[PDB]
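Hi,

I'm pasting everything inline rather than attaching a file, because the server keeps stripping attachments. The sequence lines come first, and each chain or strand is labelled.
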Amino acid sequence: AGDLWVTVYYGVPVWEDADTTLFCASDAKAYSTESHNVWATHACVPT
Amino acid sequence: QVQLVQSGGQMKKPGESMRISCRASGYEFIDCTLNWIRLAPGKRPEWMGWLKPRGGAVNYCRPLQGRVTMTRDVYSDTAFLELRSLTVDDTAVYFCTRGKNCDYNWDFEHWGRGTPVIV
Ligand SMILES: *[C@@H]1O[C@H](CO)[C@@H](O[C@@H]2O[C@H](CO)[C@@H](O[C@@H]3O[C@H](CO[C@H]4O[C@H](CO[C@H]5O[C@H](CO)[C@@H](O)[C@H](O)[C@@H]5O[C@H]5O[C@H](CO)[C@@H](O)[C@H](O)[C@@H]5O)[C@@H](O)[C@H](O[C@H]5O[C@H](CO)[C@@H](O)[C@H](O)[C@@H]5O[C@H]5O[C@H](CO)[C@@H](O)[C@H](O)[C@@H]5O)[C@@H]4O)[C@@H](O)[C@H](O[C@H]4O[C@H](CO)[C@@H](O)[C@H](O)[C@@H]4O)[C@@H]3O)[C@H](O)[C@H]2NC(C)=O)[C@H](O)[C@H]1NC(C)=O
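And the predicted assembly:
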């Protein structure tokens, strides 16, 4: 027998500061597969 | 880009042999097939045989079956060809040639600089 209730929203635009694992994305412009880079490896996802 | 630097063209006499090298770069020497197309005066560009540098697999042209011998040093990435029983007619400029891609050998976008043998 009330007036106001808890209402739950999913997709709410909020964020908090955080530390996390960051993966790499490369420009993929390195044509030569032979001459491959030490930092921009094949594991870097395409940009 | 890839490039196929070649040997100097030696001077020879009939009833002898010749060996002309061809070093490749810019691509994995094994993954792609290399050819030998020589050019004599006025005749159609003569293909002699392809060489697959995986296990030295080869396929020579019928008239050259017996004289021709295409090998390779997979370590120095060099392509070798020997041609015995020389003639003044088999005289030509020689060009090592790999295709556009490894899925098709016959589109020769990449040619080596001509090596001129004189007989
Ligand atoms: C699976 O199994 C297969 C089959 O077993 C294997 O296939 C075989 O592969 C080998 C390669 O590994 C291939 O070998 C051939 O070898 C040839 C080299 O032989 C030549 O030289 C010898 C030596 O003669 C000199 O030395 C002796 C003493 O050692 C002396 O007595 C001679 O007189 C001569 O000496 C001279 O110099 C000295 C210097 O001091 C002087 O003192 C002296 O006075 C002389 O001047 C010769 O014996 C050979 O002669 C044969 O071949 C010629 C070719 O015309 C014939 O005219 C000759 O009669 C003889 O042929 C004999 O056999 C045939 C066939 O049965 C008979 O009809 C005939 O009657 C004879 O009995 C050579 O001159 C090499 O040159 C050759 O390549 C050349 O030939 C081919 C054609 O055969 C050409 O297409 C090439 O372009 C070349 O020109 C070849 O490499 C075997 O031939 C081959 N087997 C078969 C059946 O083909 C295979 O390897 C194996 N494994 C695998 C993985 O497959």
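Chain A touches chain B through two residues (CB under 8 Å).

If the labels don't parse on your end, tell me and I'll reformat.
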